[PDB]
Amino acid sequence: SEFNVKIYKLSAYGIKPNSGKNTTPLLTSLLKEIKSKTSDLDKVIIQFEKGRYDFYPEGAIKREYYISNHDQDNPKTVGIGIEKFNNITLIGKGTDLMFHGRMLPLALIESSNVKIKDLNIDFEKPQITQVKIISNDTTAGNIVFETAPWVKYKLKDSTFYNTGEGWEMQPTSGIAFENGTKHIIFNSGDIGVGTKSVSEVSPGKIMAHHWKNKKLVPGTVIAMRSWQRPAPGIFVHKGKNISFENVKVHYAEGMGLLAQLTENIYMDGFGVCLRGKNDPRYFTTQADATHFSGCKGEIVSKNGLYEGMMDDAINIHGTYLKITKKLDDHTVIANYMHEQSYGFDWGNIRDTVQFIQSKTMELWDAKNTIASIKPILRNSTDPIKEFRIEFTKALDPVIDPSKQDIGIENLSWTPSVVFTGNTIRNNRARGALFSTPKPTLVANNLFDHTSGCAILLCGDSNGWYETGSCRDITIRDNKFVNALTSMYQFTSAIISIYPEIPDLTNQKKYFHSGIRILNNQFDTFDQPILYAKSVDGLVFTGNKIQTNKEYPAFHSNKKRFLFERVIGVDFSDNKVDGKPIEML
């Protein structure tokens, strides 16, 4: 008021570091009061000190949230709820926010001009279980594994459970890592784990009686997990002008940062990573580091570190609805198709939409405009699965769900992207997924031993229902070091342009266009550099390919360049081991 900013040092308001008390009910009561006073014009700062603050489920808010690309288990146990609260900055000074149990650490809901700064999010007991191979008898298939120090397990009926505060989970798969390098072991990917038929040798030494894998040599560290992903580390819904400066998420039961329906996002020094060379842990998030579902405006993600995640560093995409019924020339019923992306809005009046022929992944050039959109809900308390959309223009009768499978992309909720000077390494699946028609720069990044392919441009309106016909994308001045040591969906080359197209031989229209790959360095042991399916306009120029033998060549695709349904190729000034490689 008489202050430009009101700054609350948290310690002046009964919230101290290293107290080991439950900070949840306190920060919750305090933010509720600061909000009930501060006007929308009013600028607020919440300030944490050097040290550790522990949050537990007790006294947390219970919100029903629908979160793109996550399990829809409700309610969510929310540690810090920033809801309908503007011009607010949470800052720390090497601050460690430590969570317990199954929680959503930080939720930013329907808030504008929120900045989060110099703060670190972690759980004490990750649902991921770290173990070390002690002995592997390849003949008998007996493996003895050592639980890491922080791990509290429980055997019942010869079954290995990992535990924390109010939770107990049996791991079903894992990722294996090289000792030391923390790389993912060559040709491993997702592997089965011996959590069935087990018995305790000695405390934290577990004998797996039926586990056969010649690759899990003594010393191998294994991140045992399930497929569960009920809550991200930071969830952002319907934000405008959101900032993250020097914020690290070290683990969460879900994605590091999941932002949806949010209009501008600025990230300098974001990390989903380990605490350095001394971190005993090999693993970070249970899913994607950073994920942006149906965002718009400008996304800047720069100078970040992403390591050891159970998925990609960044995935930027929309959701295709599937048309289930045409009511008239102007009105359709359209549906959310996937179990992990439903329950949140899809569009607003005046949004630009285009339609897609799901089976051949072909766009109709005829765009439209949403005139009306209302979710269809049989009971008050039902999640959004189904909309009734009205368009301003009338639909060509070729757009009838009873003739073929038809999808809708919202071209209005598409962000532009700057993804520069980041480091991605030692992570499961791909490095980076980009699915946006809007201009996209991917520059001066380091892809250091990603398990799968460095970059994936992929759309699909049949299985995952994730939009992404790309139209404008420069991948320049990057460094790709020994990518693709392991196979995962779509991992055909270091850079894979792989849309999911059920019927490619009958496709007439190219799905992706305007892709530029210039002045990159590829350090590789294998052959595949670029795979490209359904592209019109593909520039590959001034790139440098440097061979090494750090691992054996193995990929089924033995071609540096593999094109399927690709026109518009421009290919000059490229080299392999300093020798020119020309098309002509």
mmCIF file of C-alpha atoms in Angstrom, residues 16-312:
data_model
loop_
_atom_site.group_PDB
_atom_site.id
_atom_site.type_symbol
_atom_site.label_atom_id
_atom_site.label_comp_id
_atom_site.label_asym_id
_atom_site.label_seq_id
_atom_site.Cartn_x
_atom_site.Cartn_y
_atom_site.Cartn_z
ATOM 1 C CA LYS A 16 11.508 -21.236 10.262
ATOM 2 C CA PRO A 17 14.004 -23.525 8.470
ATOM 3 C CA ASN A 18 15.411 -26.780 9.950
ATOM 4 C CA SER A 19 12.610 -26.868 12.587
ATOM 5 C CA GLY A 20 11.610 -30.327 11.356
ATOM 6 C CA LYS A 21 7.950 -29.271 11.948
ATOM 7 C CA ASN A 22 5.048 -29.687 9.513
ATOM 8 C CA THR A 23 5.223 -26.399 7.508
ATOM 9 C CA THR A 24 2.041 -27.269 5.555
ATOM 10 C CA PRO A 25 -0.754 -26.047 7.897
ATOM 11 C CA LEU A 26 1.272 -22.842 8.721
ATOM 12 C CA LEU A 27 2.125 -21.675 5.135
ATOM 13 C CA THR A 28 -1.474 -22.560 4.131
ATOM 14 C CA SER A 29 -3.024 -20.466 6.990
ATOM 15 C CA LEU A 30 -0.526 -17.588 6.290
ATOM 16 C CA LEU A 31 -1.051 -17.382 2.437
ATOM 17 C CA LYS A 32 -4.840 -17.486 3.079
ATOM 18 C CA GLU A 33 -4.489 -14.352 5.288
ATOM 19 C CA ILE A 34 -2.003 -12.500 2.950
ATOM 20 C CA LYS A 35 -4.491 -13.148 0.097
ATOM 21 C CA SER A 36 -7.608 -12.024 2.065
ATOM 22 C CA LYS A 37 -5.872 -8.588 2.407
ATOM 23 C CA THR A 38 -3.765 -8.100 -0.775
ATOM 24 C CA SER A 39 -5.798 -6.556 -3.661
ATOM 25 C CA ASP A 40 -5.250 -7.609 -7.272
ATOM 26 C CA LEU A 41 -3.141 -4.423 -7.848
ATOM 27 C CA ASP A 42 -1.043 -5.260 -4.725
ATOM 28 C CA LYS A 43 2.394 -6.940 -5.301
ATOM 29 C CA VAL A 44 3.440 -9.652 -2.723
ATOM 30 C CA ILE A 45 6.724 -11.586 -2.033
ATOM 31 C CA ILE A 46 6.919 -14.731 0.265
ATOM 32 C CA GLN A 47 10.577 -15.260 1.418
ATOM 33 C CA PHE A 48 12.116 -18.583 2.604
ATOM 34 C CA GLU A 49 15.612 -18.691 4.251
ATOM 35 C CA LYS A 50 18.655 -20.960 3.796
ATOM 36 C CA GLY A 51 17.762 -24.455 5.064
ATOM 37 C CA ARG A 52 15.076 -27.132 5.006
ATOM 38 C CA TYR A 53 11.254 -26.850 5.361
ATOM 39 C CA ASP A 54 9.325 -30.146 5.652
ATOM 40 C CA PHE A 55 5.725 -30.480 4.401
ATOM 41 C CA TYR A 56 3.455 -33.402 5.271
ATOM 42 C CA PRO A 57 -0.049 -34.336 4.116
ATOM 43 C CA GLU A 58 -1.547 -33.132 7.468
ATOM 44 C CA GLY A 59 -3.284 -29.735 7.095
ATOM 45 C CA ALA A 60 -2.687 -29.646 3.280
ATOM 46 C CA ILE A 61 -5.520 -28.430 1.063
ATOM 47 C CA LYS A 62 -7.455 -31.175 -0.822
ATOM 48 C CA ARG A 63 -8.129 -29.998 -4.417
ATOM 49 C CA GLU A 64 -9.852 -32.011 -7.192
ATOM 50 C CA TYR A 65 -7.500 -31.243 -10.155
ATOM 51 C CA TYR A 66 -7.561 -32.615 -13.700
ATOM 52 C CA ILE A 67 -3.979 -32.712 -14.910
ATOM 53 C CA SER A 68 -2.908 -33.319 -18.504
ATOM 54 C CA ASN A 69 -0.761 -36.451 -19.098
ATOM 55 C CA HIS A 70 -1.170 -37.835 -15.507
ATOM 56 C CA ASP A 71 -3.373 -40.312 -13.531
ATOM 57 C CA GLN A 72 -6.661 -38.667 -12.463
ATOM 58 C CA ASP A 73 -6.628 -39.831 -8.828
ATOM 59 C CA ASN A 74 -8.639 -37.318 -6.723
ATOM 60 C CA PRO A 75 -8.510 -35.469 -4.521
ATOM 61 C CA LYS A 76 -4.849 -34.282 -4.777
ATOM 62 C CA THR A 77 -2.954 -33.539 -1.515
ATOM 63 C CA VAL A 78 -1.541 -30.076 -2.262
ATOM 64 C CA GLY A 79 1.413 -28.732 -0.276
ATOM 65 C CA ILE A 80 1.345 -25.103 -1.460
ATOM 66 C CA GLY A 81 -1.811 -23.811 -3.227
ATOM 67 C CA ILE A 82 -1.330 -20.484 -5.087
ATOM 68 C CA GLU A 83 -4.984 -20.152 -6.290
ATOM 69 C CA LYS A 84 -6.422 -16.958 -7.924
ATOM 70 C CA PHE A 85 -3.544 -14.961 -6.404
ATOM 71 C CA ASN A 86 -1.637 -12.464 -8.596
ATOM 72 C CA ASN A 87 1.680 -10.593 -8.604
ATOM 73 C CA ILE A 88 3.119 -13.005 -6.037
ATOM 74 C CA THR A 89 6.760 -14.211 -5.947
ATOM 75 C CA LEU A 90 7.926 -17.211 -3.825
ATOM 76 C CA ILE A 91 11.668 -16.808 -3.335
ATOM 77 C CA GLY A 92 14.246 -18.758 -1.318
ATOM 78 C CA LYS A 93 18.001 -18.629 -0.700
ATOM 79 C CA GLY A 94 19.210 -22.182 -1.475
ATOM 80 C CA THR A 95 15.903 -23.316 0.118
ATOM 81 C CA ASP A 96 15.005 -27.039 0.321
ATOM 82 C CA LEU A 97 11.223 -27.709 0.392
ATOM 83 C CA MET A 98 11.041 -31.372 1.446
ATOM 84 C CA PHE A 99 7.760 -33.274 0.956
ATOM 85 C CA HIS A 100 6.461 -36.407 2.601
ATOM 86 C CA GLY A 101 3.928 -38.997 1.377
ATOM 87 C CA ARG A 102 1.833 -38.610 -1.789
ATOM 88 C CA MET A 103 1.623 -34.848 -2.373
ATOM 89 C CA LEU A 104 1.340 -32.239 -5.117
ATOM 90 C CA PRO A 105 4.213 -29.903 -3.998
ATOM 91 C CA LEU A 106 3.281 -26.559 -5.721
ATOM 92 C CA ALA A 107 -0.019 -25.736 -7.541
ATOM 93 C CA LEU A 108 -0.442 -22.417 -9.488
ATOM 94 C CA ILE A 109 -4.158 -22.171 -10.432
ATOM 95 C CA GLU A 110 -5.801 -19.300 -12.394
ATOM 96 C CA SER A 111 -3.062 -16.837 -11.319
ATOM 97 C CA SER A 112 -1.185 -14.139 -13.293
ATOM 98 C CA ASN A 113 2.351 -12.718 -12.876
ATOM 99 C CA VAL A 114 3.583 -15.472 -10.519
ATOM 100 C CA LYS A 115 7.364 -15.839 -10.195
ATOM 101 C CA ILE A 116 9.032 -18.816 -8.342
ATOM 102 C CA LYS A 117 12.753 -18.273 -7.566
ATOM 103 C CA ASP A 118 15.880 -19.881 -5.930
ATOM 104 C CA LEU A 119 13.950 -22.824 -4.379
ATOM 105 C CA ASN A 120 14.264 -26.641 -4.610
ATOM 106 C CA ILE A 121 11.539 -29.282 -4.419
ATOM 107 C CA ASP A 122 12.253 -32.899 -3.294
ATOM 108 C CA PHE A 123 10.583 -35.804 -1.451
ATOM 109 C CA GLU A 124 12.425 -37.567 1.419
ATOM 110 C CA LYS A 125 11.085 -40.996 0.310
ATOM 111 C CA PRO A 126 10.763 -41.199 -3.523
ATOM 112 C CA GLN A 127 8.220 -43.819 -4.742
ATOM 113 C CA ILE A 128 11.046 -44.799 -7.105
ATOM 114 C CA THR A 129 13.236 -47.452 -5.385
ATOM 115 C CA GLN A 130 17.016 -47.282 -5.951
ATOM 116 C CA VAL A 131 18.888 -50.646 -5.611
ATOM 117 C CA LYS A 132 22.392 -51.892 -6.464
ATOM 118 C CA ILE A 133 23.271 -55.241 -8.039
ATOM 119 C CA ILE A 134 25.445 -57.169 -5.530
ATOM 120 C CA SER A 135 25.517 -60.593 -7.201
ATOM 121 C CA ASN A 136 24.032 -61.872 -10.482
ATOM 122 C CA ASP A 137 24.035 -65.658 -11.128
ATOM 123 C CA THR A 138 23.142 -65.699 -14.848
ATOM 124 C CA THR A 139 22.683 -69.547 -14.947
ATOM 125 C CA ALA A 140 20.271 -69.847 -11.941
ATOM 126 C CA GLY A 141 18.781 -66.387 -12.455
ATOM 127 C CA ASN A 142 19.517 -65.346 -8.849
ATOM 128 C CA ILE A 143 20.162 -61.627 -8.257
ATOM 129 C CA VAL A 144 20.971 -60.111 -4.860
ATOM 130 C CA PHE A 145 20.242 -56.340 -4.808
ATOM 131 C CA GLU A 146 21.064 -53.763 -2.102
ATOM 132 C CA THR A 147 18.400 -51.177 -1.238
ATOM 133 C CA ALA A 148 19.914 -47.680 -0.921
ATOM 134 C CA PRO A 149 20.184 -46.215 2.637
ATOM 135 C CA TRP A 150 17.039 -44.003 2.501
ATOM 136 C CA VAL A 151 14.768 -46.831 1.264
ATOM 137 C CA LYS A 152 12.223 -48.348 3.653
ATOM 138 C CA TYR A 153 10.810 -51.580 2.117
ATOM 139 C CA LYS A 154 8.413 -54.291 3.237
ATOM 140 C CA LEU A 155 8.193 -57.925 2.001
ATOM 141 C CA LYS A 156 4.725 -59.606 2.014
ATOM 142 C CA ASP A 157 4.028 -62.980 0.321
ATOM 143 C CA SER A 158 7.572 -62.893 -1.205
ATOM 144 C CA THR A 159 6.702 -59.551 -2.896
ATOM 145 C CA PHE A 160 8.885 -56.431 -2.591
ATOM 146 C CA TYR A 161 7.023 -53.243 -1.592
ATOM 147 C CA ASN A 162 8.584 -49.734 -1.349
ATOM 148 C CA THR A 163 7.078 -47.537 1.403
ATOM 149 C CA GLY A 164 6.663 -43.959 2.573
ATOM 150 C CA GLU A 165 4.263 -41.896 4.752
ATOM 151 C CA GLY A 166 0.771 -43.405 4.106
ATOM 152 C CA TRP A 167 1.897 -45.263 0.901
ATOM 153 C CA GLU A 168 3.140 -48.726 -0.177
ATOM 154 C CA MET A 169 3.902 -49.523 -3.874
ATOM 155 C CA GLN A 170 5.203 -52.708 -5.594
ATOM 156 C CA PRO A 171 7.631 -51.786 -8.413
ATOM 157 C CA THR A 172 6.950 -53.533 -11.786
ATOM 158 C CA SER A 173 9.663 -52.120 -14.126
ATOM 159 C CA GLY A 174 12.910 -50.196 -13.962
ATOM 160 C CA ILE A 175 15.744 -48.326 -15.589
ATOM 161 C CA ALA A 176 19.280 -49.662 -15.124
ATOM 162 C CA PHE A 177 22.269 -47.315 -14.936
ATOM 163 C CA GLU A 178 26.016 -47.737 -15.448
ATOM 164 C CA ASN A 179 27.877 -47.279 -12.139
ATOM 165 C CA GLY A 180 29.721 -43.940 -12.065
ATOM 166 C CA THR A 181 28.842 -42.482 -15.520
ATOM 167 C CA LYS A 182 25.113 -42.707 -14.452
ATOM 168 C CA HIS A 183 24.407 -43.455 -18.194
ATOM 169 C CA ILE A 184 21.517 -45.879 -18.936
ATOM 170 C CA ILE A 185 22.964 -49.294 -19.767
ATOM 171 C CA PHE A 186 23.200 -50.067 -23.508
ATOM 172 C CA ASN A 187 20.113 -51.750 -25.116
ATOM 173 C CA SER A 188 18.253 -51.844 -21.762
ATOM 174 C CA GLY A 189 15.340 -49.438 -21.862
ATOM 175 C CA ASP A 190 12.437 -50.534 -19.733
ATOM 176 C CA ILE A 191 13.308 -53.908 -18.171
ATOM 177 C CA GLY A 192 11.437 -56.286 -15.882
ATOM 178 C CA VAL A 193 12.476 -56.323 -12.230
ATOM 179 C CA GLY A 194 12.608 -59.117 -9.635
ATOM 180 C CA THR A 195 10.087 -57.835 -7.132
ATOM 181 C CA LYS A 196 8.169 -61.116 -7.179
ATOM 182 C CA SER A 197 9.543 -64.304 -5.579
ATOM 183 C CA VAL A 198 11.907 -62.439 -3.127
ATOM 184 C CA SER A 199 13.265 -63.098 0.383
ATOM 185 C CA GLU A 200 15.508 -61.089 2.767
ATOM 186 C CA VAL A 201 19.203 -62.220 2.995
ATOM 187 C CA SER A 202 20.170 -59.480 5.501
ATOM 188 C CA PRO A 203 18.728 -55.964 6.085
ATOM 189 C CA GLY A 204 18.640 -54.093 2.714
ATOM 190 C CA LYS A 205 19.906 -57.197 0.797
ATOM 191 C CA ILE A 206 17.078 -58.864 -1.144
ATOM 192 C CA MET A 207 17.333 -62.118 -3.072
ATOM 193 C CA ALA A 208 15.386 -62.299 -6.366
ATOM 194 C CA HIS A 209 14.965 -66.038 -7.150
ATOM 195 C CA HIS A 210 13.672 -65.738 -10.782
ATOM 196 C CA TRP A 211 15.480 -62.743 -12.340
ATOM 197 C CA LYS A 212 17.513 -63.438 -15.512
ATOM 198 C CA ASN A 213 19.422 -60.606 -17.163
ATOM 199 C CA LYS A 214 23.099 -60.947 -18.271
ATOM 200 C CA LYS A 215 23.270 -57.128 -18.461
ATOM 201 C CA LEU A 216 22.675 -56.235 -14.797
ATOM 202 C CA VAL A 217 26.411 -56.790 -13.973
ATOM 203 C CA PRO A 218 27.470 -56.245 -10.301
ATOM 204 C CA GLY A 219 27.542 -52.475 -9.629
ATOM 205 C CA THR A 220 24.520 -51.708 -11.801
ATOM 206 C CA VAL A 221 22.099 -49.291 -10.113
ATOM 207 C CA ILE A 222 18.449 -49.827 -10.798
ATOM 208 C CA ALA A 223 15.548 -47.407 -10.476
ATOM 209 C CA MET A 224 12.613 -49.689 -9.750
ATOM 210 C CA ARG A 225 9.209 -48.110 -10.390
ATOM 211 C CA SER A 226 5.580 -48.514 -11.386
ATOM 212 C CA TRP A 227 3.684 -46.685 -14.127
ATOM 213 C CA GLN A 228 1.822 -44.510 -11.577
ATOM 214 C CA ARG A 229 2.069 -40.722 -12.018
ATOM 215 C CA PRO A 230 -0.696 -39.085 -9.900
ATOM 216 C CA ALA A 231 0.908 -35.610 -9.287
ATOM 217 C CA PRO A 232 3.620 -33.420 -10.809
ATOM 218 C CA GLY A 233 6.132 -31.386 -8.788
ATOM 219 C CA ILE A 234 4.773 -28.019 -10.015
ATOM 220 C CA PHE A 235 1.282 -28.024 -11.617
ATOM 221 C CA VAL A 236 0.304 -24.766 -13.449
ATOM 222 C CA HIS A 237 -3.298 -24.381 -14.765
ATOM 223 C CA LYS A 238 -4.683 -21.268 -16.587
ATOM 224 C CA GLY A 239 -1.690 -19.080 -15.681
ATOM 225 C CA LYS A 240 -0.719 -15.877 -17.484
ATOM 226 C CA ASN A 241 2.972 -14.671 -17.300
ATOM 227 C CA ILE A 242 4.518 -17.434 -15.135
ATOM 228 C CA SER A 243 8.280 -17.353 -14.261
ATOM 229 C CA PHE A 244 10.696 -19.930 -12.763
ATOM 230 C CA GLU A 245 14.220 -18.690 -12.016
ATOM 231 C CA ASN A 246 16.801 -21.147 -10.584
ATOM 232 C CA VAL A 247 14.165 -23.713 -9.408
ATOM 233 C CA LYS A 248 15.104 -27.431 -9.236
ATOM 234 C CA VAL A 249 12.662 -30.329 -8.883
ATOM 235 C CA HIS A 250 14.689 -33.330 -7.702
ATOM 236 C CA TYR A 251 11.789 -35.795 -7.661
ATOM 237 C CA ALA A 252 8.009 -36.077 -7.903
ATOM 238 C CA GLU A 253 5.426 -38.823 -8.496
ATOM 239 C CA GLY A 254 4.763 -37.420 -11.939
ATOM 240 C CA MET A 255 6.274 -34.694 -14.039
ATOM 241 C CA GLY A 256 8.621 -32.016 -12.702
ATOM 242 C CA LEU A 257 6.636 -29.068 -14.172
ATOM 243 C CA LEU A 258 3.270 -29.651 -15.865
ATOM 244 C CA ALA A 259 1.776 -26.429 -17.317
ATOM 245 C CA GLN A 260 -1.597 -26.496 -19.161
ATOM 246 C CA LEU A 261 -3.952 -23.801 -20.603
ATOM 247 C CA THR A 262 -1.283 -21.252 -19.608
ATOM 248 C CA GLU A 263 -0.398 -18.186 -21.642
ATOM 249 C CA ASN A 264 3.313 -17.174 -21.266
ATOM 250 C CA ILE A 265 6.027 -19.131 -19.426
ATOM 251 C CA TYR A 266 9.553 -17.917 -18.673
ATOM 252 C CA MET A 267 12.198 -20.338 -17.267
ATOM 253 C CA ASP A 268 15.857 -19.443 -16.607
ATOM 254 C CA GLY A 269 17.902 -22.030 -14.600
ATOM 255 C CA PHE A 270 14.990 -24.532 -14.225
ATOM 256 C CA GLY A 271 16.446 -27.935 -13.385
ATOM 257 C CA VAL A 272 15.096 -31.424 -12.947
ATOM 258 C CA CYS A 273 18.317 -32.914 -11.801
ATOM 259 C CA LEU A 274 20.581 -34.350 -9.115
ATOM 260 C CA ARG A 275 22.195 -32.238 -6.380
ATOM 261 C CA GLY A 276 25.629 -32.652 -8.087
ATOM 262 C CA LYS A 277 28.520 -35.179 -8.419
ATOM 263 C CA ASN A 278 27.850 -36.320 -4.809
ATOM 264 C CA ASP A 279 24.104 -37.041 -5.119
ATOM 265 C CA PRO A 280 23.813 -40.723 -4.066
ATOM 266 C CA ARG A 281 20.651 -40.847 -6.295
ATOM 267 C CA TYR A 282 20.803 -41.813 -10.022
ATOM 268 C CA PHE A 283 17.139 -40.913 -10.750
ATOM 269 C CA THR A 284 14.918 -37.759 -10.712
ATOM 270 C CA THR A 285 11.281 -37.451 -11.734
ATOM 271 C CA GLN A 286 8.944 -40.409 -12.207
ATOM 272 C CA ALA A 287 7.838 -38.793 -15.536
ATOM 273 C CA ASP A 288 8.772 -35.881 -17.894
ATOM 274 C CA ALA A 289 10.964 -33.078 -16.461
ATOM 275 C CA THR A 290 8.872 -30.219 -18.086
ATOM 276 C CA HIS A 291 5.598 -30.613 -19.986
ATOM 277 C CA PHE A 292 3.307 -28.051 -21.691
ATOM 278 C CA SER A 293 -0.163 -29.239 -22.700
ATOM 279 C CA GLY A 294 -2.302 -26.716 -24.624
ATOM 280 C CA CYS A 295 -0.341 -23.578 -23.747
ATOM 281 C CA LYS A 296 0.035 -20.389 -25.805
ATOM 282 C CA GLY A 297 2.005 -17.192 -25.872
ATOM 283 C CA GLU A 298 5.750 -17.534 -25.672
ATOM 284 C CA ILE A 299 7.590 -20.306 -23.824
ATOM 285 C CA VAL A 300 11.237 -19.597 -22.987
ATOM 286 C CA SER A 301 13.120 -22.591 -21.390
ATOM 287 C CA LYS A 302 16.853 -21.632 -21.105
ATOM 288 C CA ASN A 303 20.052 -22.529 -19.190
ATOM 289 C CA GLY A 304 18.450 -25.572 -17.488
ATOM 290 C CA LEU A 305 19.829 -28.944 -16.349
ATOM 291 C CA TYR A 306 17.729 -32.086 -16.900
ATOM 292 C CA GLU A 307 19.145 -35.460 -15.792
ATOM 293 C CA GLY A 308 18.066 -38.968 -14.903
ATOM 294 C CA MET A 309 14.342 -38.446 -15.473
ATOM 295 C CA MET A 310 12.035 -41.397 -16.188
ATOM 296 C CA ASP A 311 11.000 -39.584 -19.426
ATOM 297 C CA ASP A 312 11.727 -36.616 -21.721
#
